[PDB]
UniProtKB/TrEMBL annotation, chain D:
Record lineage: Bacteria, Thermotogati, Thermotogota, Thermotogae, Thermotogales
Keyword Membrane carried by entry: no
Name of the protein in question: Electron transfer flavoprotein, beta subunit
Coiled-coil residue windows: none
Residues annotated as binding FAD: C7, K9, N36, D39, M62, A93, T95, T98, G122, A125, T130, G131, V133
Keyword Flavoprotein in record: yes
Length: 92, 438, 336, 282
């Protein structure tokens, strides 16, 4: 709600059929992870840990790369979106 | 049909286009592959771009970029602000010879790299946007012989491949370089806002006029005790306000890195400057800044492959010289390949000259200097936690006139500085940082 | 003099019954003729065997009716309508031509206005007469409903204006007034048939989500795809399409062709049901051009309530099946 | 072989062109201009018509000088030629003025390849979503207008006649169009391809054929603000909707259901539903 007000300002070409943020193992995010640093350090609120699993709202991804690096267990299959997709920064 | 090229430069940032500018000016069939819609579409930078690494690339750079919208508000004043609870210690330096011999311009990188792509296109390079490189097509010798893309019939053949793709070294790890990924102490999460401030409040709050710019560097307790160097730059009709903090500090604090930008907007001084021009945010960005440097860079060369810019982790983030290092690294890689093209050898015997040029120039000497800089800043948590808020209450007490007889303000400052930290902590910390500055 | 300021309204009929927009424009042109000096509201109607509606137009407010007669005008062929709706404009010389913004209406008006070489605005919402040169100020939404641009045609005649169905208001059918019905038995001759209609597929064979009068949509409060059958019970009841959010499409509950919002489909129904949608700005940018927004979600501090017209704080599996249950017993009491 | 001409329009990216309430204007500065998304389906159909029947597809745009980048993005689909009608004689044009320029633009294309067998437009542009250029272009040539195309069945190149499925409001309908026709494509026809590199690289080093108002031979004031009958006199953003009120609550388990139908009938728009007349008329 709060940061998706500011993500509305950015320009995107969303690739909804190709999620570039896949989580390799959902069970590592349930019992192996304690603090979930992918949620607390994502500048775009992409990751939200529900009890249904991890909700990865990849459409707002700013392609920074923090989630892949801050994740201690490596279970974020992180790619850039394809060419002409993802954030399209105007006056970046 | 085979798409044949001489060099393929992955990435169209500062190091990608400066590498492609020298190859295209020297008559090489060089292709640039950028995964954005236009060059600059994925690039985040607050803006201070220094004109000397570009006057080595383009000796007529300030004439070509004056008519365009690439550059923005020539930087004549560089401030450093120590934000307190309610005060600020501005330590600026305005120079007026920077009005006619410029040192730096503020930029917006979608406006700069789109113009810089047009000069690289006029130089003779084929810039291919909307195209992400996935891996490298290899010959049976096992070396990088080109580039495969996400496009259907996408296989670009080249005698050399320049991995100028910035931070997130995904494509560097495919080339055998970067034997591990980035750990969250080699990078800093940098969250930036571009705020629309209408061209005359920019003149008023920065103390400038008429395409002359000022840069603020913000320190204080908005960064929650972590060493975050925020910034506040003057664009033409805008203000690019952002903040960057290390990932190790951000992970163990768990505080959502746009909140630091909200602590930076809602400071009493920044909310006084931009009163209600704070919430007309035009854009919200996030990126990473390589901060490991010398201890964390890859092998920047290989068989038919070079690595420039943030992909080689060439960033002096304490001086904010990353584009300074990137545009030079493109020039050193392109002059290495121009040696490699007259000899016809592209292996690690000729392409090791790029690593020799990288340490004979300023790029690796700035990395050796601030090598143990952020591990020094991580083992205090004092220079942005007590030290700005104490220098603000001391200088406020120094200027407050309340009938206190100036010896009892010279000792109330001493009772201020030797209460939040002992004198064995103050005199230690001035030279404990001296080892970080070398 | 006075009968040269003669404003036209086209009647869109589907077999035997007219479209409702035909009588909302007849009633709107009455408010245009009340501010136009020395004017009368005609009605142009094409086909044979439609005296049951040509008299209905005069009860709705048509001053006169031009009832053009041919057997090949009951079906909609824009090639044949344009040949007749520029002979009935060259003959009578109207001042304001009004067609509804149905899909036949927007397609027909584009063919007509470039035969007359006049000016045409599509999907207008703000027709009004300025008092200076008696001109029609055709206010229409552009940029997907983000700019209500006001467009005036100064000198070319007629000032054609395709008007969005539903923005005008009907006059009640009054049998007191009468008017002349002009029958022009239209001849085509050798006509060289280009458009040949083979079939007519029903509209519910695909996903419409822009030409549906009711869009009932949900996401993430519709727990699982079991709740979207409860939303489809309300969809086919009201004769409309079921929508979704990104949080429902990404969870795999409905197909991505049912997605409503910024990177989905921008709906324009007369009644939107935000059934369990939080109402983020990327979703409500596709629903803000609607007429009624009903919001049913369990969080009272939700941003959908800042755009909703009817707001319910409550569960979705205990209100939406409890609303289509009550709507069945009220739709059958006036059916038989 | 057929001759296809795809009239595309460079449109700002209206997913990002948003309403700023505090300045009460569209913040469309910095937002780059793209193909009209109804025309990417027209270009993808034209590229399908080029690999199935070998039709020489041209693409034409009457726009600003910055609209040559949209014409280069159309060559990335695999098309043969792009044609630019670039002149500020054509500036401020309306639909009658655009169609008069586009009729004489395609008429000069007809002097190069032959009579155009098919003209593909989009259903609507998004800036000024009128959708009358496609209908208007079928009248200048006197071609069969198949508008709102959702499917393409038999595109018989021997009988010079093809079957489309036009969407109307009562339902879809199959139509035997007679070529030469002017189609008008919706979003639901296809999904546009991810372009390959040999076409995208060719799209980068391509220069569209620029034709001014002297090149076409048309009237000098039948194309701009003077050939425009209509005049846009004022553009203004809409209002902030209308604050609603929680009709029911979290207490009423169903009694909120009839309170919805209580408050539905206070609105005018429920007459328009076509299925809530037995609760409004009675
Ligand atoms: C907030 C912030 C502020 C900064 N401020 C300053 C400053 O004031 N001064 C300064 O000197 N430096 C500054 N920097 C640093 C500067 O942005 C970088 O150090 C430098 O500009 C990066 O150059 P680059 O060539 O690596 O380009 P990058 O922008 O890092 O990336 C190059 C390009 O590669 C492309 N790319 C990546 N992967 C692929 C792929 N697989 N296929 C194809 N293309 C790909 C991307 O689209 C990108 O455009 C700042 C950085 C940040 C984050
Ligand atoms: C570039 C971009 C484009 C986007 N495009 C779109 C788009 O086209 N369309 C789109 O929809 N989104 C789009 N989004 C996503 C958008 O920003 C929101 O994140 C998204 O719409 C959230 O979906 P939601 O409201 O259904 O889910 P949530 O935000 O989780 O909504 C859940 C709501 O349901 C309520 N609820 C919970 N349980 C119940 C129950 N039992 N009964 C009733 N209510 C209940 C909750 O209280 C809450 O209000 C886009 C995002 C980006 C970044
Ligand atoms: C706020 C505003 C309101 C306007 N209102 C009107 C109005 O009411 N009536 C009116 O006639 N004009 C109007 N215009 C101007 C009108 O858009 C131009 O005359 C333009 O030529 C028609 O574009 P369109 O929006 O009607 O697109 P459409 O006609 O809906 O576009 C349909 C298809 O035609 C083709 N096409 C459209 N434009 C071009 C072009 N320039 N070159 C080539 N092919 C093209 C494309 O294939 C496109 O997909 C308005 C402009 C603005 C800014
Ligand atoms: C009479 C005289 C002695 C008055 C003293 C005034 C004094 C404050 C400045 C001039 C004194 C000179 C002779 C000192 C020599 C060494 C100087 C250059 C040390 C630099 C540290 C500070 C004080 C610089 C001034 C503030 C302002 C101009 C900074 C610009 C902003 C950016 C570009 C710089 C970022 C930056 C910051 C923020 C550092 O904290 C830091 C710490 C250690 C090394 C480098 C840096 C650094 O580069
Ligand atoms: S960090 Fe790795 S483990 Fe912890 S939650 Fe995110 S993904 Fe699951
Ligand atoms: S990339 Fe940056 S934004 Fe996209 S998810 Fe990882 S962290 Fe959040």
């Amino acid at each position: 709600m709060r940061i998706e007000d500011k993500l509305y300002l950015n320009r995107y070409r969303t690739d909804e059929e190709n999620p570039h943020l896949k989580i390799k193992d959902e069970s590592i995010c349930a019992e192996k992870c304690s603090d979930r640093p992918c949620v607390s350090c994502c500048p775009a609120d992409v990751y939200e840990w529900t009890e249904s699993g991890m909700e990865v709202k990849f459409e707002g991804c700013l392609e920074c790369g923090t989630c892949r690096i801050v994740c201690p267990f490596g279970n974020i299959e992180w790619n850039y979106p394809r060419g002409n997709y993802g954030v399209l920064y105007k006056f970046g | 049909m085979k798409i044949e090229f001489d060099v393929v430069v992955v990435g169209a940032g500062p190091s990608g286009l400066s590498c492609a500018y020298v190859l295209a000016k020297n008559g090489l069939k060089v292709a640039v592959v950028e995964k954005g819609e236009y060059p600059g579409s994925k690039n985040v930078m607050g803006g201070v771009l220094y004109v000397h690494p570009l006057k080595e690339i383009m000796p007529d750079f300030l004439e070509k970029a004056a008519n365009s919208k690439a550059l923005e508000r020539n930087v004549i004043e560089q401030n450093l602000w120590l934000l307190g609870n309610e005060g600020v210690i501005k330590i600026g330096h305005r120079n007026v010879e920077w009005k006619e011999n410029p040192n730096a311009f503020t930029v917006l990188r979608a406006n700069f790299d789109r113009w810089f792509a047009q000069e690289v296109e006029k130089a003779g390079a084929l810039i291919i946007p909307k195209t992400k490189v996935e891996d490298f097509l290899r010959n049976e010798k096992g070396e990088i012989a080109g580039v495969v893309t996400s496009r259907p019939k996408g296989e670009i053949h080249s005698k050399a491949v320049v991995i100028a793709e910035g931070v997130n070294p995904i494509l560097t790890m495919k080339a055998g370089l970067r034997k591990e990924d980035l750990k969250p102490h080699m990078v800093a999460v940098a969250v930036k806002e571009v705020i629309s401030v209408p061209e005359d409040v920019v003149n008023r709050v920065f103390g400038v006029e008429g395409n002359d710019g000022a840069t603020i560097e913000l320190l204080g307790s908005w960064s929650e005790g972590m060493f975050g160097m925020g910034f506040l730059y003057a664009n033409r009709s805008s203000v690019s306000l952002g903040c960057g903090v290390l990932l190790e500090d951000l992970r163990k604090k768990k505080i959502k890195p746009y909140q630091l930008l909200e602590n930076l907007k809602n400071h009493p001084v920044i909310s006084d400057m931009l009163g209600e021009y704070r919430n007309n945010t035009m854009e919200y960005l996030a990126h990473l800044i390589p901060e490991g440097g010398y201890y964390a860079m890859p092998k920047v060369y290989g068989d038919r492959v070079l690595v420039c810019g943030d992909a080689a982790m060439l960033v002096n983030s304490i001086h904010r010289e990353g584009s300074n290092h990137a545009i030079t690294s493109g020039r050193l890689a392109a002059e290495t390949l121009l040696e490699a093209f007259e000899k016809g050898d592209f292996s690690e015997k000729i392409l090791k000259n790029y690593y020799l040029r990288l340490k004979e120039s300023f790029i690796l000497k700035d990395l050796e200097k601030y090598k143990d800089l952020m591990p020094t800043m991580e083992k205090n948590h004092q220079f942005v936690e007590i030290y700005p808020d104490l220098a603000n209450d001391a200088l406020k007490r120094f200027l407050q006139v309340d009938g206190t007889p100036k010896w009892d303000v010279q000792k109330q400052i001493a009772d201020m500085v030797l209460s939040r930290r002992s004198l064995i902590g103050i005199s230690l910390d001035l030279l404990r940082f001296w080892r970080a500055v070398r | 003099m006075s009968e040269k300021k003669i404003i036209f309204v086209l009647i869109e009929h589907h077999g035997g019954k007219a479209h409702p927009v035909s009588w909302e424009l007849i009633g709107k042109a009455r408010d245009l003729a009340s501010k136009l000096e020395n004017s009368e509201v005609w009605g142009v109607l094409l086909g044979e065997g439609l005296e049951s509606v040509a008299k209905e137009a005069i009860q709705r407010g048509a001053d006169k009716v031009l009832y053009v007669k041919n057997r090949e005008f009951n079906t909609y062929v824009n090639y044949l309508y344009k040949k007749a709706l520029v002979d009935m404009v060259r003959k009578y010389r109207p001042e304001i031509f009004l067609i509804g913004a149905t899909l036949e209406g927007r397609e027909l008006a584009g063919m007509v206005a470039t035969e007359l070489e006049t000016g045409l605005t599509a999907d207008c919402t703000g027709l009004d007469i300025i008092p200076d040169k008696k001109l029609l100020a055709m206010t229409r939404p552009t940029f997907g409903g983000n700019l209500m641009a006001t467009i005036m045609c100064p000198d070319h005649r007629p000032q054609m204006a395709t008007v969005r169905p539903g923005v005008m208001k009907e006059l009640p059918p009054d049998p007191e007034r009468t008017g002349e019905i002009i029958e022009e038995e239209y001849d085509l001759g050798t006509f060289d048939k280009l458009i040949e209609i083979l079939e007519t597929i029903p509209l519910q064979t695909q996903v419409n989500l822009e030409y549906a009068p009711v869009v009932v949509a949900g996401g993430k409060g519709v727990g699982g795809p079991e709740g979207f059958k409860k939303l489809k019970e309300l969809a086919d009841l009201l004769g409309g399409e079921v929508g979704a959010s990104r949080a429902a499409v990404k969870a795999g509950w409905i197909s991505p062709e049912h997605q409503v919002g910024q990177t989905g489909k921008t709906v324009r129904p007369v009644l939107y049901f935000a059934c369990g949608i939080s109402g983020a700005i990327q979703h409500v940018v596709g629903i803000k051009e609607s007429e009624i927004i009903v919001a049913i979600n369990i969080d009272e501090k939700a941003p959908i309530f800042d755009i909703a017209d009817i707001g319910i704080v409550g569960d979705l599996h205990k209100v939406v099946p409890a609303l289509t249950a009550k709507l069945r017993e009220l739709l059958n009491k006036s059916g038989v | 072989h057929a001759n296809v001409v795809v009239c595309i329009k460079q449109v700002p990216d209206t997913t990002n062109v948003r309403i700023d309430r505090k300045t009460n204007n569209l913040v469309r500065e910095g937002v780059p201009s793209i193909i009209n998304p109804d025309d990417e389906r027209a270009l993808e159909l034209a590229s399908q018509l080029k690999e199935k029947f070998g039709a020489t597809v041209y693409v034409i745009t009457m726009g600003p000088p910055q609209a040559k980048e949209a014409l280069k993005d159309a060559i990335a689909f695999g098309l043969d030629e792009a044609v630019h009608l670039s002149d500020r004689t054509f500036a401020g044009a309306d639909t009658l003025a655009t169609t008069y320029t586009l009729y004489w633009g395609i008429k000069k294309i007809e002097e190069r390849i032959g009579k155009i067998d098919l003209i593909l437009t989009g259903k609507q542009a998004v800036d000024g979503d009128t959708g009358q250029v496609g209908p208007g272009l079928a009248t200048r040539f006197g071609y069969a207008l198949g508008a709102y195309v959702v499917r393409i069945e038999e595109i018989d190149p021997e009988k010079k006649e093809m079957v489309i499925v036009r969407r109307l409001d009562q339902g879809f309908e199959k139509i035997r169009l007679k070529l030469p026709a002017v189609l008008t494509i919706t979003d639901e026809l296809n999904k546009p391809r991810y372009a390959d590199l040999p076409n995208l690289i060719r799209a980068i080093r391509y220069e569209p054929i620029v034709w001014t108002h002297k090149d076409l031979g048309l009237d000098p004031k039948k194309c701009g603000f003077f050939g425009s009958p209509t005049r846009v006199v004022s553009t203004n953003i809409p209002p902030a909707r209308k604050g609603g009120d929680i009709i029911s609550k979290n207490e009423d388990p169903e009694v909120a259901a009839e309170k919805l139908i209580e408050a539905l009938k206070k609105f005018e728009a429920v007459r328009l539903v076509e299925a809530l007349k037995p609760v409004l008329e009675g």
